[PDB]
Every structure is written in C-alpha cells, then in structure tokens.
Amino acid sequence: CPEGYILDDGFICTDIDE
Numbered sequence: 001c002p003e004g005y006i007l008d009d010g011f012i013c014t015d016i017d018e
Contacts, residue, residue, distance in 0.1 A: 001013040001014075004016040004018070
C-alpha cells in the first residue's frame with residue numbers, strides 16, 4: 001500500500017479513496 005494507504009486495526013492495508 002502506497003502513501004495514504006497505511007496499516008490500521010491490526011497492521012492491515014486500510015482504504016482512503018484519495
């Protein structure tokens with residue numbers, strides 16, 4: 001996951017949509 005798409009909850013690819 002690139003910039004903006006970070007790791008949340010328990011270190012998982014989180015969404016964003018720009």
